[PDB]
Design a protein around this ligand. Structure first.
Ligand SMILES: Cc1nnc(Cl)c2ccccc12
Length: 207
């Protein structure tokens, strides 16, 4: 298990997300689904020139999995996945410019729901989750588990668990007062409202 520090701007963005009073928390789901959709667009496009890129899985879909016992809501996709370099450096590096712009916009009237317009919507997961675990597998790399309870640090380890073939699972360990996002009717309401026109089948699992 390796422990890394988030870059200062990213740590600041996560603190803001965690500390700002903002009741419209549901937007986190639209943001994660949109991220899944972009990851699925990526593998689908690369597979046009290299069909073997789908040898790790032909299905392209998004599954939403609530688990009341564990208090988690998991967003699963069979998209392109993330390499170790993406997890420890590249994604955070790219999010720096969007972070600065977003934070500037916030001081100038914008609100949290616009986070996705700045390409840093993944961090909105912290509106609802006290901890986020990400299991991911990219064709060119091993399966990894990234995890963070914010606080300026995250971990990365090679994952020994059930192999996923290819894709990403975002496991949201929900805050005590955010369990409504485990309810079937609440999830459906949010997906219908914000994610109506996504081009991959989204399956809402039940318990
Ligand atoms: C920026 C970003 N987007 N999506 C996912 Cl699943 C991430 C996981 C770890 C770190 C950054 C992420």
């Amino acid at each position: 298990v390796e422990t890394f520090a988030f870059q200062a701007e990213i740590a600041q963005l996560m603190s803001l997300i965690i500390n700002t009073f903002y009741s419209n928390k549901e937007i986190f789901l639209r943001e994660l689904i949109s991220n899944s959709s972009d990851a699925l667009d990526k593998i689908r496009y690369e597979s046009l020139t290299d069909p073997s890129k789908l040898d790790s899985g032909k299905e392209l879909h998004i599954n939403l999995i609530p688990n009341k016992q564990d208090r988690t809501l998991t967003i699963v996709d069979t998209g392109i996945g993330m390499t170790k370099a993406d997890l420890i450096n590249n994604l955070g590096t790219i999010a720096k410019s969007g972070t600065k712009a977003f934070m500037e916009a916030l001081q100038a009237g914008a609100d949290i729901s616009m986070i996705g317009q700045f390409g840093v919507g993944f961090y909105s997961a912290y509106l609802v989750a006290e901890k986020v675990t990400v299991i991911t597998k990219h064709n060119d790399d091993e399966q990894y588990a990234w995890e963070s309870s914010a606080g300026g640090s995250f971990t990365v380890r090679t994952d020994t668990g059930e192999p996923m073939g290819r894709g990403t699972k975002v496991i949201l360990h929900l805050k005590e007062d955010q369990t409504e996002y485990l309810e079937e009717r609440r999830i459906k309401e949010i997906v219908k409202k914000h994610s109506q026109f996504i081009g991959y089948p989204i399956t809402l699992f039940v318990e």
